[PDB]
């Protein structure tokens, strides 16, 4: 009936922080409860902040009437500043011509227990990724396929970035089926910086075979400045631990690394593609 856009994943226990309605053609949009908003031919902006000790967990925008648009291939809703895992969001909606009204809902969790690990990891992390999509494997190497029906940019050779419902993804490097899911690690806003890193176990049984990396970040513009996520050197068999480096140009608000393991891997999986 409307068209629905999501940043983050709603869960039942989430508190309701804010909901409101906006006419998108109005000059100026009608401020609701002090949150500055604005309308344009091209943009709707809501400057939201919660003066309470909560983390934003999910934002949903529904627009009317329903139009023709596969939103999984675009990012028309995003936080220019703040976002998931913080108490603020400068919410940006890139509207289309026929879109004239919008309903906004914003959910949160206590800042004390600001963890999203469960809702993104789920029950079957081995076979289901953090988008709710099941890993799929090609017939030659048995390594995971590139997702086909969602937003994805490429940059430098080997760099592929995915976006769905506000959540970004990059994969280092290939998943194989006999790999097992070891643990998932999250960094929350209090541990995030322009450049930060985490240390992973890498000895014996827990030989890191594959990293599935997800994050939310601010984007100044519709096109994001993607981060440089990379091992600090090679993650070889002798390394007792492996350090993952997050070298960002735009600030991340929350990050989640799925750690897959395999004693049989040597750290390097490559196809004859060049
Ligand atoms: C319709 O409304 C949107 C939202 O307000 C306008 O987009 C805004 O445009 C200005 C100017 O292009 C952007 O300013 C930029 O700010 C950064 C802050 O660091 C600065 O580095 C840039 O050089 C630039 O000055 C602003 O960010 C941008 N806002 C969003 C949310 O994208 C748009 O211009 C309006 N359309 C008009 C006026 O025709
Ligand atoms: C592997 O160990 C070497 C020796 O200290 C180190 O220089 C390198 O950064 C390690 N690799 C990772 C990914 O931590
Ligand atoms: Br603005
Ligand atoms: Br959760
Ligand atoms: Br953790």
Q: Specify the residue with its C-alpha closest to ligand 2, atom 7.
A: 233
Instruction: Give the atom of ligand 1 at the shortest distance from the alpha carbon of 38.
Output: 5
Kindly state the tokens that stand for 105: 């809902």
Burial of 196 (0-12, 13-18, 19+ CB in 10 A): middle
- How far is it, in rounded angstroms, from Cα 227 to Cα 120? 21
User: By the 8 A CB rule, do 86 and 56 touch?
Assistant: yes
User: By the 8 A CB rule, do 225 and 249 touch?
Assistant: yes
Q: Write down the domain spans for the chain.
A: 3-110, 117-261
What is the 218 CA–ligand 3 centroid distance (Å)? Answer: 14
Experimental approach taken: X-ray
- How far is it, in rounded angstroms, from Cα 121 to Cα 256? 9
Burial of 201 (0-12, 13-18, 19+ CB in 10 A): middle
Instruction: Give the atom of ligand 1 at the shortest distance from the alpha carbon of 40.
Output: 1
- How far is it, in rounded angstroms, from Cα 188 to Cα 256? 9
CA dihedral sign, ordered 216, 218, 224, 227: negative
Give the distance, in angstroms, between the CA of residue 202 and the centroid of all CA atoms in the same chain: 25
- How far is it, in rounded angstroms, from Cα 150 to Cα 210? 22
* 167 φ, ψ (degrees, to nearest 5): -95, 125
Task: Return the ∠ at Cα 103 (arms to 120 and 73), rounded to 5°.
Answer: 50
Binding site membership of 197 for ligand 1 (Cβ less than 6 Å): no
- How far is it, in rounded angstroms, from Cα 152 to Cα 93? 19
Q: Is the peptide bond before 38 cis (omega within 30 degrees of 0)?
A: no
Instruction: Tell me which DSSP letter residue 71 carries.
Output: G
Among residues 161, 179, 177, 174, the alpha carbon closest in space to that of 228 is found at 161
Could you please report the per-residue DSSP string of 173-241? S--BTT-EEEEEEEEEGGG--SEEEEEEE-SGGG-EEEEEEEEEE--SSSS----EEEESS---TT-SE
Kindly state the tokens that stand for 62: 């529904």
Instruction: Give the atom of ligand 1 at the shortest distance from the alpha carbon of 92.
Output: 31
User: By the 8 A CB rule, do 85 and 254 touch?
Assistant: yes
Kindly state the tokens that stand for 15: 């508190």
**Any idea of the CA torsion for 200, 201, 205, 207, to the nearest 10 degrees?**
40
């Amino acid at each position: 009936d409307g068209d629905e856009y999501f940043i983050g994943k709603y869960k039942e226990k989430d508190e309701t922080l804010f909901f409101a309605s906006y006419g998108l053609k109005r000059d100026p949009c009608q401020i609701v409860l002090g949150y500055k908003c604005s309308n344009n031919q091209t943009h709707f902006v809501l400057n939201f902040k919660t003066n309470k000790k909560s983390c934003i967990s999910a934002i949903k925008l529904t627009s009317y009437p329903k139009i023709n648009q596969n939103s999984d291939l675009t990012r028309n809703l995003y936080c220019q500043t703040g976002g998931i895992g913080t108490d603020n969001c400068k919410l940006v909606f890139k509207k289309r011509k026929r879109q004239i009204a919008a309903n906004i809902e914003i959910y949160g969790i206590p800042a004390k227990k600001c963890s999203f690990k469960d809702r993104y990891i789920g029950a079957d992390p081995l076979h289901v990724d953090s988008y709710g999509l099941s890993y799929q494997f090609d017939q030659e190497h048995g390594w995971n396929l590139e997702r086909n029906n969602i937003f994805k940019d490429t940059r430098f050779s080997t760099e592929v970035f995915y976006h769905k419902n506000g959540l970004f993804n990059t994969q280092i490097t290939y998943l194989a089926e006999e790999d097992s899911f070891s643990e998932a690690r999250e960094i929350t806003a209090k541990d995030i910086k322009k450049k930060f890193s985490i240390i992973l176990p890498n000895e014996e049984y827990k030989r890191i075979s594959f990293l599935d990396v997800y994050w939310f970040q601010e984007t100044m513009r519709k096109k994001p400045k993607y981060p440089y996520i990379h091992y600090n050197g090679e993650c070889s068999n002798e390394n007792k631990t492996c350090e993952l480096v997050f070298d960002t140009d735009e600030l991340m608000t929350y990050a989640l690394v799925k750690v897959f393991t395999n004693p049989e891997s040597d750290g390097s999986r490559l196809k004859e593609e060049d």
